[PDB]
Amino acid sequence: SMKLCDFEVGLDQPFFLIAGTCVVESEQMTIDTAGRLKEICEKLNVPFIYKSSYLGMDEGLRILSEVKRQLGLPVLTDVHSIDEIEQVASVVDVLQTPAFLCRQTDFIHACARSGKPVNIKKGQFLAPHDMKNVIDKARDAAREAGLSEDRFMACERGVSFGYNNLVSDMRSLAIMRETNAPVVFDATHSVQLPGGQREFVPVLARAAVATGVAGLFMETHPNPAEAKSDGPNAVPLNRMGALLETLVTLDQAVKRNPFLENDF
Amino acid sequence: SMKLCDFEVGLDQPFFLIAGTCVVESEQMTIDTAGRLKEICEKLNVPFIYKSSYLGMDEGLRILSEVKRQLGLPVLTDVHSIDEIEQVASVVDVLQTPAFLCRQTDFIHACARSGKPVNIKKGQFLAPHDMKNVIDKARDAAREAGLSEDRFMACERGVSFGYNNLVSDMRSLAIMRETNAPVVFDATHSVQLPGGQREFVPVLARAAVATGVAGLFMETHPNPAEAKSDGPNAVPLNRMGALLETLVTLDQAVKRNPFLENDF
Amino acid sequence: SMKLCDFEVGLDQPFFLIAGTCVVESEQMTIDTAGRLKEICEKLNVPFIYKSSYLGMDEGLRILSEVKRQLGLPVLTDVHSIDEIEQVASVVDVLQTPAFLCRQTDFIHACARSGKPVNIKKGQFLAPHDMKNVIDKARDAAREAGLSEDRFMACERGVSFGYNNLVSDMRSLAIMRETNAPVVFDATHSVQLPGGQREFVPVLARAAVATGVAGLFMETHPNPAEAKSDGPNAVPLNRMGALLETLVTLDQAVKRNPFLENDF
Amino acid sequence: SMKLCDFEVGLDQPFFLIAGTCVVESEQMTIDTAGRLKEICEKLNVPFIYKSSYGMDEGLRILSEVKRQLGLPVLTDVHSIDEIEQVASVVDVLQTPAFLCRQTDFIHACARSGKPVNIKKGQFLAPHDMKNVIDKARDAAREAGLSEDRFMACERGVSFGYNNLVSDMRSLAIMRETNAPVVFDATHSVQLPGQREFVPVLARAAVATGVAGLFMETHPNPAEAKSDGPNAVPLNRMGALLETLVTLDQAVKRNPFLENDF
Ligand SMILES: [Cl-]
Ligand SMILES: [Cl-]
Ligand SMILES: [Cl-]
Ligand SMILES: [Cl-]
């Protein structure tokens, strides 16, 4: 298990949820959604990290400070450039790197040296085995900076499948265990057609948790039709409870005994 | 729900298992493997159909007739040409079509009119939505012979992914529900590299069962290292009970409540 | 495990259900109730035996024969005297002994050599440790007839608690494991006040399944208000699904691991 | 729900655990056991209250140290009207001996103590009788300026012939009519007025029945325990059992209790 915010995560722990609205829409929208997700995850005993991407950076980050302060929740956001990292790491608990930047070594190194843990998204162009090199390079930067190495996660978000389609290869979730980092599944982005697919979010979420992951990322919204960003792939907030209850059941079923593939 | 052999199958029923050795190796290998699967499946309440491929056709079919006569088990085998349909159908309980022949309508029609149910394999070159037409055509032929139309299953066995690789798109398992036929997942052939992938058989089996299917196919062998065909991808017989017990748990979890994707 | 009808029962197996209307009311009431229970238990994967007590003996058994004929279900009925055994055993799949006859050794003996398995009810006057002697005697008789000994269940139905009251001692369910026979819990009669307690049927069913049993016996009816016998303690047929769903979850939870009492 | 210590309890909430060594044996025995129980319960999200019985001065001192050092709420039994003031000044929850459930001067005094009270049902009472006991405790509280929602009804067995108790699961449902959280005492419900094998059995049954709380005695080495060793659950098995109980608790509270439709 690696230490993440106030809990332990890993293939050998209960899965954690990263969830929130796609973009920081307003302050009430973010605080209300964060609070509702807290209550949902509290009842299910699912460790929960709130996400939104950044109204302006400053105001987005301020609102993220308020979720942290008001609700006591850890928060995660994406960083897009080396110059954003110092400011973002001073506010949030976990950085996340864009999938397209997974091979930009200066940028990955900079996140690695930030002093915060990093959820490293796997590019749509990588093979699952390539993620070992990504994580290893991040760990060299961390070690160079005097920081611990157990602070990265490998995040699956789909691989290119012809034009304008992604496929979620469940083998990837098993392969990336070789990174010795927690594996996270991004269920919302894995259904997106590049360049609504909501119906497939529960499908891939069930499939992934059953495969065996450390964490799950999902976007949500109270009324997704009225969402400011990527609405058609968000799970409505009033259905998150039922979905998570099913995923907890799958997670317990597959972790209660060793994974058969390990005996192969 | 569809009647298959002496049980009810479908998305709302507990999953059924199709399993056996890849090919008929020997009468004793087959009877022993079949018998030991029967005891594993009886203990878990998993409906079970024995499968092996046809030592020559006459001899392979004789031996399958013995699995039937000695053990009271339903049996399934794949049929390779129109010429063999009549003989094979007089011995087995369920026909299965090779994936490459899924668009050969004369062949599909002949299987459909055979008098036996047919597990129709989705070609590695088809899109999931294409399988509706294949099933609709099979049902035409059934109907024209006076036969019930609910005697077909849609079988996922992987889709081409670059060269020498297949990917198991879990969205396919949901999409093919539109065929109004039971969807069956072939976990063994889904991991094969076309043109040593055993470790992914349980991974995809767990993923597919969590996604929601009517049926599961897997090859097994008492000692896969000595198998006469596809040995590297066979699950060992002495690990089948453990695997099946996990799959039952998953199957129940996802079918206890409606699938969330149906709200979408 | 013990082999029962077409399945395997026991303390380590998923629980089975014995259920039906208290008495055979009519052919249509029996067939419809049997058919509804069949479909509910099929979906939940609960092995199922239909029961009703005998319109006259001849007509009662005829109708139970129709349940087998028309629905292919196994059927259980109670027998009341030695002279009725040959006829009843010629029709039904499982005999049941009335609780008050549990010490009538000639009658218990005749049932035990009938050629059919027997659910032996524990008299309201017996202590749980006394059932071992009953089962041991039944097994003597079976063995002497050249029959298998593993063909009996011990069925808990309450113990006398003062006047006009029965209590369900959950310790009995554990103690009677020493019979080396599957233990069955009669939820419907355990709530009866000798000489409407329906509300306690779910209570005691949940307690018993959580305690750990091989089987459950419950009386049901489409509309208990119009039931010809024991109507006020029957579970309505339209609530059986919901109840059984809860009970399967409890059964799995307690049988996933060893029972802690086996360490002590 | 009712507020109890820093959490909410009730038939509609996750079950809480009351547990500890039968008696206060030692400061280190008490602090170590309370610490391991805290860790086990934290891991499972089981709200936890530490119990041991008390001489009295030294017993309450050691119980104050469990609170100070581990931040846990503590419960103990009080035996007489004249112990109440001191006990309530130290502990978070009082508990009344079963035999005293109809001794109303005593029950009233506990009710006016300022603390919540787990009221044990006498082995001689019928389940319907606890309503009267709770109503009278609530009157005493109200007549003294205190909130009425501070009592729990605790099942610990009913007399069954001579030298035996039986745990009537109907009692746990019936006592919901008190509109107070129902607590099951799994340890004393097996005691013959050497029965540890029935503690898991009754705990599982009671949780599946549906209760607000569970009480169990434990010890690191029951063989070497100073009272009731033969009925203690060994500490190194409490995790396993509680894990089972949590699943049962969740499963029965996930939907409405079917008995509420009949
Ligand atoms: Cl697609
Ligand atoms: Cl690969
Ligand atoms: Cl009563
Ligand atoms: Cl006893």
Author numbering:
A (entry chain B), B (entry chain D), C (entry chain C): 0 to 53, 67 to 207, 215 to 283
D (entry chain A): 0 to 53, 68 to 206, 215 to 283
From the paper:
We used an “ortholog rescue” approach to maximize structural coverage of these gene families, which are likely to be essential not only in B. thailandensis, but also in related, but more virulent, Burkholderia species, such as B. pseudomallei. Using only seven Burkholderia species to select orthologs of essential genes, we solved structures for 49/406 essential gene families, and for 56 total Burkholderia protein targets (including seven ortholog replicates).
By using an ortholog rescue strategy for insoluble or difficult to crystallize targets, we increased our structural coverage of B. thailandensis essential genes from 31/406 (7.6%) to 49/406 (12.1%).
